[PDB]
């Protein structure tokens, strides 16, 4: 069963990451982004209130909601922190959709995010060191440890 293999890889990836190892480069990117997203959401909450609490979405307007936000986020630039913001926004929009019994939108939002990444963020990412550089900058929970020290 391919499901059993996926469960094994998930668990082993997690335990390797706790020791500073990684199952794969992709696994290292995933973990650093999870950590950066947690930290982003903490900082956002303290300055502006929780990201989920301010979102409006209905199935008939879901793309409009997505693009209105993402277009402003990247209107005047791309950088690693704004890429983290983009992921955190998508997560919050999915949580809000589930809260409001609009579960159908989770799959749509995931697709819109992947397409936006492919078309509009990947060019910048490839010119700025790729996801390997993101891991160098954000791995080992680096953004949170920075705030914790100050």
């Amino acid at each position: 069963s391919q499901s059993n293999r996926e469960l094994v890889v998930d668990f082993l990836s997690y335990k390797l990451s706790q020791k500073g190892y990684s199952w794969s480069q992709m696994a290292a990117v995933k973990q650093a982004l999870r950590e950066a997203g947690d930290e982003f959401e903490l900082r956002y909450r303290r300055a502006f209130s929780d990201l989920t609490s301010q979102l409006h979405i209905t199935p008939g307007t879901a793309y409009q909601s997505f693009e209105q936000v993402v277009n402003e986020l990247f209107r005047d630039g791309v950088n690693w922190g704004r890429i983290v913001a983009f992921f955190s926004f998508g997560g919050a929009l999915c949580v809000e959709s589930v809260d409001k019994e609009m579960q159908v939108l989770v799959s749509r939002i995931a697709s819109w995010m992947a397409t936006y990444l492919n078309d509009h963020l990947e060019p910048w990412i490839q010119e700025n060191g790729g996801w390997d550089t993101f891991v160098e900058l954000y791995g080992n929970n680096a953004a949170a440890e920075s705030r914790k020290g100050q």
Binding site: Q68, V69, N71, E72, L73, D76, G81, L137
Partner: peptide
């Protein structure tokens, strides 16, 4: 728009958590 203002706030915090070498 309201969602536009969320995008602006995301950019502000994104710039705060942005890291450089």
């Amino acid at each position: 728009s309201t969602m536009g203002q969320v995008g602006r706030q995301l950019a502000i915090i994104g710039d705060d958590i942005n890291r450089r070498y």
